[PDB]
Structure 1
Amino acid sequence: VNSFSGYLKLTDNVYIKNADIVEEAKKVKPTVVVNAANVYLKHGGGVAGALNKATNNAMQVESDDYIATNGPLKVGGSCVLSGHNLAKHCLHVVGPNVNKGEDIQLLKSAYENFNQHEVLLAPLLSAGIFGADPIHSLRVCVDTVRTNVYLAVFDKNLYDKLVSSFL
């Protein structure tokens, strides 16, 4: 048993809810929240900007030190940093950004990072402002992630469409 509430069960391991991931993280305090990061860990908008704002910019301060030491992530890659006030850990995962011209085939590699964690609260990778088709992102998630993932879908209209169209 875990603390996640009100999710629709899609598969053995994938659950989904219409939720603000910031509000969900604040309520659940999961072991792992996933950030929709870029390779620079520059948390300006979407989930990253919202998560970072909720940490009072502490996520960005920690991230800048990480990049100064290690250099940028890879598209498809990840790093584990603090979850600050939102979670034990934040798994920063870089899905391909279609609005920057990145290979959508990298989305499966991005989701493979989730398999290193038994349970995660996460957004749909490459969805929202990263420009991918969220229906596709959900299909790759279901077909890639084997650990237990709780997906927060910000947009109520997209949530309804993802559930209704799910195979």
Structure 2
Amino acid sequence: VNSFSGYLKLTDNVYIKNADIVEEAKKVKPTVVVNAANVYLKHGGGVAGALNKATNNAMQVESDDYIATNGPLKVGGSCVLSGHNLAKHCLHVVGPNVNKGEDIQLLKSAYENFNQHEVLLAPLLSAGIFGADPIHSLRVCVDTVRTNVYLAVFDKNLYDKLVSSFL
């Protein structure tokens, strides 16, 4: 038993809710919240901009030190950093950004990072400003993640479409 509430169950291990991941994180305080990161950990907009703003920019400060030490992530890769006031940990995962021409096949590699964590609160990778089809992203999630994932979908309209079209 865990504290996630109001989710629709899609499969044995994948759950979905119309929710603001920031508000969901502040209420649940999950062990892991997933950020929709880029390779530079520049949290300017989308999910990343919203999560960073909710930490009063502490996520960005920590991220800049990480990059100065380690260099950029790989597309499809991840790193674990603090969850600040939102979660114990933040798993920064880089899905491919279609608006940069990155290979959509890397979406499966991005979701594989979730399997290193038993339970996660997450957005749909490569959705939103990353330019992928959220329905494809949901399919890859279900077919790749084996650990327990709670997906927060900000837009009510997209949420309804994802549920109604789910196979």
In the alignment, the residues of structure 1 paired with residue 2 and residue 103 of structure 2 have an alpha-carbon distance, to the nearest angstrom, of 35
Per-residue deviation, 1:71: 0.0
Equivalent position of 2:88 in the other structure: 88
Q: What is the alpha-carbon root mean square deviation over aligned residues?
A: 0.2
Per-residue deviation, 1:93: 0.0
Per-residue deviation, 1:130: 0.1
Per-residue deviation, 1:107: 0.0
Per-residue deviation, 1:140: 0.1
Equivalent position of 2:52 in the other structure: 52
TM score, norm. by length of structure 1: 1.00
Per-residue deviation, 1:106: 0.1
Q: Deviations over 1:34-93 (max 9, x none)?
A: 000000000000000000000000000000000000000000000000000000000000
The answer to whether the aligner puts 1:113 opposite 2:108 as a matched pair is no
Per-residue deviation, 1:127: 0.3
Q: Deviations over 1:96-139 (max 9, x none)?
A: 00000000000000000000000000000000000000000000
The alignment partner of 2:150 has SS state of: strand
Equivalent position of 1:153 in the other structure: 153
Gaps of 5+ in 1: none
TM score, norm. by length of structure 2: 1.00
Which 4+ residue blocks in structure 1 deviate beyond 4 angstroms?
none
In the alignment, the residues of structure 2 paired with residue 74 and residue 139 of structure 1 have an alpha-carbon distance, to the nearest angstrom, of 22
Gaps of 5+ in 2: none
Per-residue deviation, 1:144: 0.0
The alignment partner of 1:151 has SS state of: strand
In the alignment, the residues of structure 2 paired with residue 23 and residue 140 of structure 1 have an alpha-carbon distance, to the nearest angstrom, of 25
